[model samples]
Target: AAPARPAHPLDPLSTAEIKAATNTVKSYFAGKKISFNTVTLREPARKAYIQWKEQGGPLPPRLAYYVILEAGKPGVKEGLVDLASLSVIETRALETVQPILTVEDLCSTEEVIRNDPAVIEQCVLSGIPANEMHKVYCDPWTIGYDERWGTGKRLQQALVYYRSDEDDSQYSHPLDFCPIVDTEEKKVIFIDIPNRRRKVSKHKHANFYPKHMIEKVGAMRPEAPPINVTQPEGVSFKMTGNVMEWSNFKFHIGFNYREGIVLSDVSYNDHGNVRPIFHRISLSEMIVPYGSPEFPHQRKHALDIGEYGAGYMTNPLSLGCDCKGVIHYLDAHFSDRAGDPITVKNAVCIHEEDDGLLFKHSDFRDNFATSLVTRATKLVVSQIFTAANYEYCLYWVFMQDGAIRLDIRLTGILNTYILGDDEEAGPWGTRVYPNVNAHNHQHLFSLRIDPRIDGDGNSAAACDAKSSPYPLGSPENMYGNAFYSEKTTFKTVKDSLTNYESATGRSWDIFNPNKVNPYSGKPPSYKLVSTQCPPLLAKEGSLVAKRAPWASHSVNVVPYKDNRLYPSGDHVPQWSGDGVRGMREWIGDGSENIDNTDILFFHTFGITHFPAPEDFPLMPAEPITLMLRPRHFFTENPGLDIQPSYAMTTSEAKRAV
Candidate 1:
């Protein structure tokens, strides 16, 4: 009998599947205390998916990956289960690395620190009254591997704060001490007190709410007229199950606990022929490294995806604000701490936007009256997730001309520290407000793309615009103005392990060597155009470098392998960055042949920000964008078929409305 679930193999796990998988594991561990850490879909093998998608093969098995913590166990218990058969297929124990910090784990620490006598003592030491524990607040953050505790225990360093009123901002008045909480034990284990203590700021609170801002300024700027976006008809894109069909593109939308959005089995419909583009694409991991070199500040480098899950922290989007026009949303399902299925409504939003002018031209001879202006529309799939003091808005845009764009906007409050009015912020930070110091930091992201242009066998190359080899007076270049694009194909894995060069305007191309473009005499390819790349500023062999090895370089190509999703190993919490794991292990010897083979390309690109006073209170959104555009894959403009919004001749213009 067929199961009542989504038909596609790439679809995420259903609520029923999560319950069945957790129930099977619960029966096996009956009479024991266990907490569910993760219960997500286990995607099918790459080969099995190819056979089912390309040929007419049977569907792959539906599987679930589960991670749990026992009452008295030192390590986590993880395994895979076949949901159809309701049997355990694989089981293992990871003693070294700890599981991720769930919402439950992070939430439980504040209470643990609140009731602890030691923490209460430190709170009074920081100038708070002994009985005013209700005004105390803390933002629990994962301890990014301290040498003293090593990786044996799951820990969180509570950044303490004080707020006089419940609605006031707690970040403006950060305390001078840190408390380490054992998440498993649910108690404050240690407190790191600074050498010199600084009391809470006596200045007015830095508030951003409308009422508070209006009260501070006495009046507000005039509001702009309301401009609403509407779709007179209905949406253009159609969603069947999790597979989305829009314009000429078709892809499967998959969500998980780590990577919030996963696009799979992407293809383009060219006339009557269908051609595969990317097999899978995802934002694998990201690291936010603070530059302050103080005592406990060294523990502030947050591996957000590995330590705390993006799927777990995603916000439930609201209508009319989070999305505009005619919108369609998809729900996400996961197992909570009690091993019960929970759903986040509107986890992913889908909509369309006016993309301005696609193509336009006019005849100068006819007094610029003859014109054909085509307006384009783009499909957007987006989600927003909050990590304590920061928010990230991610948009995956698909244009009519076969271009894919990923846009990330960084906003929300800055992670601040306590400062005194008499002291400056040294060189590592900026005093954004009275007694508030914002540290320098870099937001680096890893984008993984599995290219399948025309077929599974694909190659990649670095293309740079370079001047001619000949000198100014040489035979080849007498005028000294000759420049051409220099293409270097990557033969081995190490050849692709390189950084971006802005001097030469460098970009990378993923192409099918066997399928030559008849028009351009080159391979059919998709070009990656990304310019914003800041090298990991951490010193070599530092803790940040050791933990996130992939952040130093801009491009990496590896042969396709199963279960190689995360760049920073599987279990990221409390990892000491010792031994062979993650990107370092994937690039062993760096002699693997990746030419014209099924390979995955990972690019690291982001901005380094030095905070200023302009970024005070609630910071405005800062955007980072990158694109995958078509190179020689199309014979002509692929969007020429789109109907133009306006077309007129000289004679028609004279009699126009």
Candidate 2:
């Protein structure tokens, strides 16, 4: 084994370590009588974590793990029963214990589907005759049981697809019966709703149909020519399976069943001085809260990343289709249902591409014109999570210009149901086909950015640039629309959380008072520029609204707490009552010493999805972008030096005599 300390603590586990961890769990449960869903690698502890990396200090070799066990008996199923206590099981040796995990309320694979033959039988027999039952896709459903409708009963569901004749490309050509199963009983709980008949969409995009000859539909698709992007002297980046290093960027990337792809110890080199930017960055949780006045539709809210492990559902990416240029693919290893390690190939694609124009200017004063062919390199970590009828793609992007973009691309077939000719689906839904109605929904996501700016101490605050609010020295909106803006330091955690203002557009920045910029003569900071914002459109105190308080605001900055990560809550199918307050609980009654303190920046943005006709067959990707820009964090636009292909032409070759 290569014995050494890595550049970052958040490095992914090796294939051998993953197998060893599985073995460790198996050894712990040896004759202990336990049925576990998964054993995931947890984020390494933060106590003196930084010291171990930066200072090269020695720390005990400890790996954290997330265990999900089922309640075999009655009392075992408590509030935190979904998750179990963390154990420090010895890897291939005498196992031990170090349980400091706060709660057991975590979403496990068992919460969704039971991997049983009986469940498959029920999934097929739920609707059309067993013979007519074609293919059934078992996926993560909302499991929308609330405290208002009390039940601790765990559940799972399947989406059915049927077609009679042999080869056809209509796997998505729906079969109405949705089978909700009780994992223990292996029986269908969704039997309450009968009339399992849907106006199956036979005419879809005429694309990939199972066992059918695929039609050639690449007429307008552009041809791919060989593109190469190589360092002048081979590859300049350094890598060791888990950790990576480039010109200025160096960090560790880890993949868990829950939090897709997490980045840690992200530091960038500024003028030969490496400064820490963020300690960790990941999507804490994503809540898809659908809306409709209909009876069953009201309970359609779902948590994607929580219920179904987003990283676990990562779609194997195809080379030419998924990315361009000379790409570097990273494989992610995760535990399957049987606790077997499975690999998702090309889970992350890193490459460089010419993004058109970087910078160009013409100084006619000197008759000199210049243009830079700016190309951008990126580390694109993406995953495709299949949720019933819709599939969501999340891309965590890192650019060369000290920028990070968290984008969600929504695709897959729209959630369509049968409707009457004159059925007023209200304004909430739209009629695509004859009786195919597409319901309205919202996809809300939370990005947890644990930034340390220029190392540890940082202050996060929000500012609004409004038309001067003073009315001709009247102290408030003097000229009716004069705009004014001010950056307010949030002394308390509670005081910092806010929504996007209608009167004035809002922006947030994290400043390090200690690291002053020579150019701006102020503290260097990173600001978030949200192109668009989604409001919590649901009614006040509604089912979903009560549960997803993180969706209520645009930004929530709170002091760092090891236990607090997921903004919505750790538990899936949560209650609005006394269960978990989520982000609200963490921020509420929090310390006032947020400034110059270790902080967690919870940045959120979402989309109010209204399904359209074009969304049929396979929906187009609607990408919502959150751009984190460097504000005075660099002396100038750091991207200028990181240029494109700047060029000039001369009439003669050299200096003509």
Candidate 3:
């Protein structure tokens, strides 16, 4: 009989799986009931899984459990080393499971927000009303006292929610509050609220959309007339819970408590045949290092993904607000406070959209012209994570041309601080408001790409275009400053870590050296294209560098180790001398085989944000994108297969233009 509840090896642990794993752990460690913090699936060996997927074979299933052990427990410090060997438990039995991975350093919700209706006074700040102050906060207690923001954890942070009855836009009425943690008598002192400071500006207004009748404040009018995205054609997508098959594309998406979105077995179809591109690709880790000259604020670096679990910080999306087009909404199962089950509705949304002109041509001189036709449709898979005051929306976009684009859109409130009389917060920060100073910061994010081009054996190379010096008298001399593209391949790990030359428009490609294209006689491959500087902006060897050394380069192609999935390991929200647990540290001496072995490449990308007045009320979303294109991977224009159906524009329309 076919199993009704077939195993989805690639998906995040289901609520039932979580329960079973917890029960198993409880029974195994019955007397030694170690306190637990985090638990999720430990992905199977890619080599094993791919073999099982491509051919028919056995690939064992597994789970990883991260427990915050009590005082006397075997491994109770801050990382996984002490507990790693003993914490894992297998899930297969007479019908059972595999080992669990133990993660120790986790930035819990306590560090996220202090939602209690507490009596902590936040009225000390200059802009907030003293008597009306209703909120205050503290931490896991360690990163709370750090001076350099070394943990990159949101140091010296606070938020106050306005008393109201309305939509959940308190995310809009942010207030600042600093704190005091008294471990002695277990007391909290909210003495210095920074409340005696600046006068509040008129622009300081709270957003109470779907306004509560309890408060007299005016509400921002919602967009008029009914509006929503519709899949009028009954939708062209399918999902077997874990596997999502969309038009021309199919991939499995999963989430971990630590790494946000994990996509695997990504394959694209061509010539009516499905081909593999990436075994897995995902945002492995990210860091926000804030550079403020002021004391305490200087060390405000946040390892959002490592310490915080940006995946766990996912948002419950809105219908018309979060996405548009033929949207397919999906829910995520999470283990909440009780180690029980919880669902974040519309947590992940998949949809399609028009990406403007794909290709266009007109043969005017050769013959009577047929109207030029052009249009491109794109499938987008997106999810949003609100890490503190900032929100990151990640999009996995697949185009008709066989190109895949990773787009990062940043939105939400600025990490604002009460400022002085300066109109243009020069060295202080961006004067987003009379009393608000938006600090200077670097938003560096890295993606780990495990590409299985023709198979698992792949090679990587770099390509750069540079201008050539003029010849005394050559036919090509007419093209002043002759330019040519240069390509380089790597046989060692160290060769891959280097800067991207803006003038040269440097790019990288991953190809199956063993497989060649029939028409071009070239290796079937994909080229990475980026139009931004590789900013290792924070001081070299600084906390930011020590924490995410991988962020320093444009690309690093190294040998693959199943455990080496994250650019930065699971131990973020780190302590000094404790070092980082991410990929850079994993690449000690940069020694690894690079000729025809399973390879993984890291792409680090981000933005340097300088706050301004416009960024105050709510910063508008800015997109940071990276695209991968077919480079001899397809015989010709892969997009030619897409029927050319265009919109209105007559011969008379051309004359008007």
Candidate 4:
């Protein structure tokens, strides 16, 4: 089916655009077995976008970016397609780097492992009957740079497992062997056998599905009553193409093959004047580093976005289950290996949620007779994606009080490994089941913020809450209890490359130095209030550290540069992280001045997981949140204009029946 013509330059590529882009690339390499890797919108330049948006100039040229792999080609080919002309405009041959693994590439490994002779033998030794090769299963993950292969060929590590019957949970019956498969060759190159092998557990499968639970555990627990969400007057938000306007905020919602959802040109209207906040915000990259000192375990750092995209792995969300309350969903489109368009419905859910209270107040003199209260409603844009064994649910929320919050929920089953009945998990791992060992890991996420704070002359500062500088007996500390904010403006990129200081209650501020709030006598700013920051546990010279260099710091501000989105580099499949790419290159000697310049603020925050028995089968959602709140940006309470739910005065009051 054809897609509607785009109304904005930042709108995600339509199905028609995808078809034209792929067809152009296919024609360029006619007769060759070309595999489409990615086809999505190449966003217009920041200047071009601003000109077209603010000046009412001509629309920027529409273009689609695509990545492809040829059967006989060694490296990936990337290019841009001019949708108007249906012709290839620019192309680059990435000879040294490998493109990300598509869903097709990830799905093809299961069949390859089931048929391999060596893998079958390893499965047999792990107590899986040799004849039951059909029962063998594996979760294919990007081989995060093995010393043996060293990115010579594309690779995936087969985390082997077994299931007695098709219905059994393979997580409980982990097989104690790993297989390294050359993804391109479609063959197992080597199988890493542990010196001490463990057999699969004979215990009943740790199943969580309804049918198995009902059969074994008898009657299931009573179902809880449902809480339905209804909006009689329809939704408050209005959408023009991918742009959204609700309350006083407006922004563009973009989806691509890498970042699942991208919020761009975020701004809020103050009275009649429009004030820009963030130019763009997205989860650019993330790393999952499992802590285990064993040989092959050292290579467990998986860069989800760089290795396998969040967009590529996103689930088609179900109504009421994934979201509630007069929801509006946006579909996402991508290209498959066959160069065909694949649409994931309900990939982005947009809705409003009751936010408890916006504000409340009562006059002390007349508190008993006069009061006012206002409720808050927040707009949430969310998406959920499964990265093999884990689900990452992301929510980007906008509040009526001029604030933005990002809430992330981590759930799904643990990545289990085989453990001998007599063997102990030791300090590196926890025994989650009879023979399953779940290792300690950290989910570190990097949030990219391009602030336009009032008009792009933004400077970031590390503001720490501190006690009075004067001594207890000093005049300034007469009461012995005086405190103020100690703000240290970042003068250079090196100064901004710092970590979270929990002792002082540190929070960073991105503010327009030129725009000072008259009432508060401070620069217009938005503060980053994120406290959940976990350090990268991997060692300095370890492969995990090198591949995920951005994870090392909690806050990093670099001068704005075009095409500097991904922190782990663009093509992240098989490259060693020793090269100067991504964040490492972006922060050169760290001497580049970032003060009062258009800069990108990168913040790393997440949780460290030490698995436990209760986390087995299926783990409940563990949530973490961060906010970009208005500091001195608003002259007064931004929510003051909101209609109060109830307001009363002693002189004029009404009684309700």
Query: What's the CA error at residue 23 for candidate 4, in Å?
Result: 1.0
lDDT at residue 40 of model 1 (Cα atoms): 92
lDDT by residue for model 1 over 1-657, one digit each (tens)? Answer: 223656788888888888888888898889999989999999998889999988988788888999999887876999998888888899987766688887887778778888899989988887877799888888899888899887677788999888889999888889889999888899888999988888877888899887898999886788989998888888889899889999989999889878999999999988867889999999998999999999899888888888887788888999888787788898889899888999989989989999998889998977778899999899999999888998999999999989999999999889999998887896999999999989999999999998999887999999999999999988899989999999999999899987899988999999999898889999999999999889999999989989998898999998889888898898887787776788878877899988999898999999998998888888899999999998898888888888889889777877873
Model 3 deviation from native, Cα RMSD in Å: 6.5
lDDT tens per residue, model 3, 361-427: 7655434243567697788878998776788999988887888899989998787665555545667
* TM-score (all chains, Cα) for each model: 0.98, 0.82, 0.82, 0.97
Which predicted model would earn the best TM-score?
Answer: 1
TM for candidate 4 is 0.97
Candidate that beats the other on TM-score, 1 or 4, i.e. the better one: 1
Residue pairs with backbone atoms closer than 3 Å in model 4 (clashes)? none
Q: Write the per-residue lDDT of candidate 4 for residues 514-558, one digit (tens) a residue.
A: 988999999999999999999889989778888888899999899
Worst 10 residues of 1 by lDDT: 1-10
C-alpha-based local distance difference test score of model 4: 0.89
Q: Model 2 segments beyond 4 Å from truth?
A: 1-8, 74-127, 135-142, 146-151, 157-161, 164-179, 194-236, 367-376, 470-484, 574-577, 590-592, 640-644, 647-657
